[PDB]
């Protein structure tokens, strides 16, 4: 590189450690830049010559790492982990630790390739209909679409084995490659495998314990809304297509991975003829830029007490699926360029409820890179990845009140009653309490992958092993070790760890309490709104700033009293329709659970010639 990026000499000494890392800091922010901005061209534009560019920044990074990565332990290594000032031995330690850029050239040429493609074939793929070679159907928007609305088994069915094949086979030989590289660079760097580094991020000796406990608290919540939800389907599609006894098929939920199924509310809204929790209607009605969504849920983050979004966000962002065609990573995900000026959301915003809080969910991110970006470069990154992705879903949940709705215009009218408590609390507990299996299952099968425990020779039977045991769900069609279905998720082929979503989902109500508290809310925490509580933005803003500064167990405990993940906020959240589910299944003799594994449903009557 430019050697005016490179090192240069310091002492062995710890105020020379120190002095070590001010420079680094200084230098790192133009080589974490450049290769921010040029991956920022190939998402919004997927073109060959943009690839090859951002495979270069890479390699640049990649050796920039490399330079401080082993001089920081040239000399700061046998002595770090006495250094006075730890929120600095955590900054030489994130320095320490280089991972690829361990990796000879030609190892880092391939893994940089690796990445660049499969983001490519999964961001790239799509599904064609049979006899017409006429349009064919994408991701975003067509499959997710007919996915959150079409009612009809074979359609649905259509669009989850194409999108299934489509993405999965093509990527499975460049997973393994990429999997057995990001081990051997880590193996390097202390861990055994990608799995441990992952989970080093937490810093609980006992994370996974804790975890697998934590879910055992949940895992009845999840079980009741699922054989309340099964039965509602079984009223819809039949007997042949679903079992009462067995796991739902993967393909009914109302979404491609079936993480959520607040899209099919209107199927099982408990209490319908009421007024509709779902302004994924008058949101339409009215007249909304995909940019007036960026507005609402900004003005929600003014009021509390904290900053707008700057200027350069909103021009340095796509907030719509471009015109000019330019093949696109639609996916909605927040940058933070490190130059404490730039930040922008990437996203193909269109115009519903389930994006709206998509919408803040990023914003999260973005307010969060805009608090800490006044510290150092090895912590911007905050207490936990869990943090980070609870942020924006916390003010979410304010939101997403029908009352909260209704002081910002989607809710018209108002029954502050019970029957209208019970939908609104069913349909929060299709989005949160269905996503918990799922979050905790996929980093469940890759700790496993990365680990030697599941072989390419098991990739779909361990995945739908997990699948099966955590979400009770089958596959449609019938699968073999010719497929990856793992792969038809965007975060595996962007190689992003998923556990972090499921700490975030507990952790999101930790706060949400938290806050209502300081907020001075006084009524149920689920129907609690910290909205214009410049008191409560307060409280949550001393926790951004912090970043990777101290550990996120203390700043946990300042912000919630408590020094670690707990489930008791969250089951007070629910509290109603946790009981009211459970009693609705007894009376309707329903069996929680799925006895009957192994079960398949059948394929339509002539597959595949139909409505499509
Ligand atoms: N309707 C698509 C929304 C996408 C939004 C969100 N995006 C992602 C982006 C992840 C990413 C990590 C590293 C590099 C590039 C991108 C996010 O964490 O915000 C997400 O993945 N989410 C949000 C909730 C659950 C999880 C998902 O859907 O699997
Ligand atoms: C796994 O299942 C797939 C089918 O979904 C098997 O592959 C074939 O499927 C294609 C259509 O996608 C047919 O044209 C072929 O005739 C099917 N092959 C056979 C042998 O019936 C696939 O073979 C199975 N894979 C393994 C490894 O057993
Ligand atoms: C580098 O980090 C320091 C903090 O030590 C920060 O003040 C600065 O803005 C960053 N970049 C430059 C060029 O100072
Ligand atoms: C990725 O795909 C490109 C073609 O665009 C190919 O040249 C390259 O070999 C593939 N990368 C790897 C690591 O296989
Ligand atoms: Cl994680
Ligand atoms: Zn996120």
Same mark, same amino acid.
């Given at each position: 590189l430019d050697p005016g990026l490179q090192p240069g000499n310091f002492s062995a000494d710890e105020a020379g450690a120190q002095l070590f890392a001010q420079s680094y800091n200084s230098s790192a922010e133009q080589v974490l830049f450049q290769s921010v901005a040029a991956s920022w061209a190939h998402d919004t534009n997927i073109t060959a010559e943009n690839a090859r560019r951002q495979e270069e920044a890479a390699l640049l990074s990649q050796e920039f790492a490399e330079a401080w990565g082993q001089k920081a332990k040239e000399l700061y290594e046998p002595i770090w982990q006495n250094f006075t000032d730890p929120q600095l031995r955590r900054i030489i330690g994130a320095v320490r630790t280089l991972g690829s850029a361990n990796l000879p050239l030609a190892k880092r040429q391939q893994y940089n390739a690796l990445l660049s493609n499969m983001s490519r074939i999964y961001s790239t793929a799509k599904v064609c209909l049979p006899n017409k070679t006429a349009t064919c159907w994408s991701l975003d928007p067509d499959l997710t679409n007919i996915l959150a609305?079409?009612?009809?088994?074979?359609?649905?069915?259509?669009?989850?084995? !194409?999108?299934? /094949?489509?993405? !999965?086979?093509?990527?499975?030989?460049?997973?393994?490659?990429?999997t057995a590289l990001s081990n051997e660079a880590y193996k390097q760097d202390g861990f055994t495998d990608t799995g441990a580094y992952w989970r080093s991020w937490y810093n609980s000796?006992?994370?996974?314990?804790?975890?697998?406990?934590?879910? *055992?608290?949940?895992?009845?919540?999840?079980?009741?809304?699922?054989?309340?939800?099964?039965?509602?389907?079984?009223?819809? $599609?039949?007997?042949?297509?679903?079992?009462?006894?067995?796991?739902?098929?993967?393909?009914?939920?109302?979404? &491609?991975?079936?993480?959520?199924?607040? /899209?099919?509310?209107?199927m099982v809204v408990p209490f319908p003829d009421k007024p509709n929790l779902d302004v994924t209607s008058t949101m339409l009605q009215q007249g909304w830029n995909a940019t007036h969504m960026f507005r609402v849920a900004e003005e929600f983050f003014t009021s509390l007490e904290l900053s707008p979004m700057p200027p350069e966000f909103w021009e340095g962002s796509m907030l719509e699926k471009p015109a000019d065609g330019r093949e696109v990573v639609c996916h909605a995900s927040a940058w933070d360029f490190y130059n404490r000026k730039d930040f922008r959301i990437k996203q193909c915003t269109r115009v519903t409820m389930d994006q709206l809080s998509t919408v803040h969910h990023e914003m999260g991110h973005i307010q969060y890179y805009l608090q800490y970006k006044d510290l150092p470069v090895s912590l911007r990154r905050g207490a936990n990845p869990g943090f980070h992705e609870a942020i924006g879903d916390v003010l979410a949940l304010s939101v997403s009140t029908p009352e909260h709705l209704h002081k910002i215009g989607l809710l018209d009218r108002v029954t502050n009653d019970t029957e209208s408590d019970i939908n609104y609390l069913l349909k929060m507990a299709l989005e949160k309490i269905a996503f918990l299996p799922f979050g905790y299952l996929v980093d469940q099968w890759r700790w496993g992958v990365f680990s030697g425990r599941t072989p390419p020779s098991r990739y779909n039977f361990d995945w739908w092993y997990l699948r099966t045991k955590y979400q009770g769900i089958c596959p449609p069609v019938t699968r073999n070790e010719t497929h990856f279905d793992a792969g038809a998720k965007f975060h595996?082929? /962007?190689?992003?760890?998923?556990?972090?979503?499921?700490?975030?989902?507990?952790?999101?109500?930790?706060?949400?309490?938290?806050?209502?508290?300081?907020?001075?809310y006084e009524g149920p925490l689920h129907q609690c709104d910290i909205y214009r509580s410049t008191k409560a933005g307060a409280?949550?803003?001393?926790?951004?700033?912090? !970043?990777?500064?101290?550990?996120? %167990?203390?700043?946990?405990?300042? &912000?919630?009293?408590?020094?670690?993940?707990?489930?008791?906020?969250?089951?007070?959240?629910? %509290?109603?329709?946790?009981?009211?589910?459970?009693? *609705?299944? *007894? *009376? /309707?003799?329903?069996?929680?659970?799925?006895?009957? $594994?192994?079960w398949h449903p059948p394929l339509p009557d002539n597959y595949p010639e139909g409505i499509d």
């Open positions: 609305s079409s009612r009809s088994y074979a359609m649905l069915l259509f669009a989850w084995e !194409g999108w299934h /094949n489509a993405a !999965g086979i093509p990527l499975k030989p460049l997973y393994e490659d990429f000796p006992t994370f996974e314990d804790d975890l697998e406990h934590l879910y *055992q608290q949940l895992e009845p919540l999840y079980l009741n809304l699922h054989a309340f939800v099964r039965r509602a389907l079984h009223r819809r $599609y039949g007997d042949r297509y679903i079992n009462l006894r067995g796991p739902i098929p993967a393909h009914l939920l109302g979404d &491609m991975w079936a993480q959520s199924w607040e /899209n099919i509310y209107d595996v082929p /962007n190689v992003t760890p998923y556990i972090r979503y499921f700490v975030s989902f507990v952790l999101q109500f930790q706060f949400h309490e938290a806050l209502c508290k300081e907020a001075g409280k949550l803003r001393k926790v951004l700033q912090a !970043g990777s500064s101290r550990p996120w %167990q203390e700043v946990l405990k300042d &912000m919630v009293g408590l020094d670690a993940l707990d489930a008791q906020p969250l089951l007070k959240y629910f %509290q109603p329709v946790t009981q009211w589910l459970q009693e *609705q299944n *007894q *009376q /309707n003799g329903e069996v929680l659970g799925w006895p009957e $594994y192994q």
